[PDB]
Amino acid sequence: SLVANEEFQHILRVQNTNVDGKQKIMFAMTSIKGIGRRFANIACKKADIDMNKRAGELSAAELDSLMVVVANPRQFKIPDWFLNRQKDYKDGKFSQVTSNALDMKLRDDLERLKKIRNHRGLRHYWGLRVRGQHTKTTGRRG
Template identity: 35%
Template sequence: MSSEFKYIVRVAGVDLPGDKALAYALADIKGIGVSTAQAVAIKLGLDPKRLLGTLSDEEIEKLSNALREIEKLGLPAWMLNRRKDPFLGVDRHLITSDLLITVRNDIEFMKKIKSYKGTRHMLGLKVRGQRTRTTGRTGLTVGVKRGKETPQQQKKGE
């Protein structure tokens, strides 16, 4: 068993800092939050407050395999990030590039079927019901344009 400290640890294909607590280091992986990281660590019998760099190679391998197949750990379905997948019909948890690709495909599907959300995505507008009157403005700024000063305004300025 190696007792040396690792400053960079590769878990589930992502380089993580070894000087962070296990739960917070795992939260740097796309698709894993602090709550999920703590739940996974506890299920594997690891202390979530322990520094990631102090884990042995076997524990890192065990952790990496568990993160790739979180559904098999027996966590409640509400902790998974893809419940009732519309195409597969099962509860799944996606991480890293799998999550990014799936979200991009979902948006493309919404655009293809021309749902309300898909149309909002196409137009580059807010999708989740936020106000658009004052926020989310992009493009050229619109302001008040000053015209030529009248003789009366010139006298007031002097």
């Protein structure tokens, strides 16, 4: 088993993201935006993938299983508190957004804040800190 199989893949694609084949599956999946070590770990656990294998060792069907697990956390008993999009503003649904969907959600939040002239939105627009930090001495880049 120590010898690489002929099917070993050095580079694989998932949601238009390059995934390193040499990295372990748990930490290889983290290259996708919106997926971290905790979420990747639980997704691998729920998909029955063996955590000791590399990203390139597995088969494509296992990547599809991982993606369905990620896209339907509720179906696999992943709790609501474990998701990065809880109680959505418009739909009010709980889901794990990833890749360009995460950027779309972030842009929607920022533009919604800016449209109503909310203070946080104005701070975002001006390029200043939004979480109350002092700005006299730190955060100097331009």
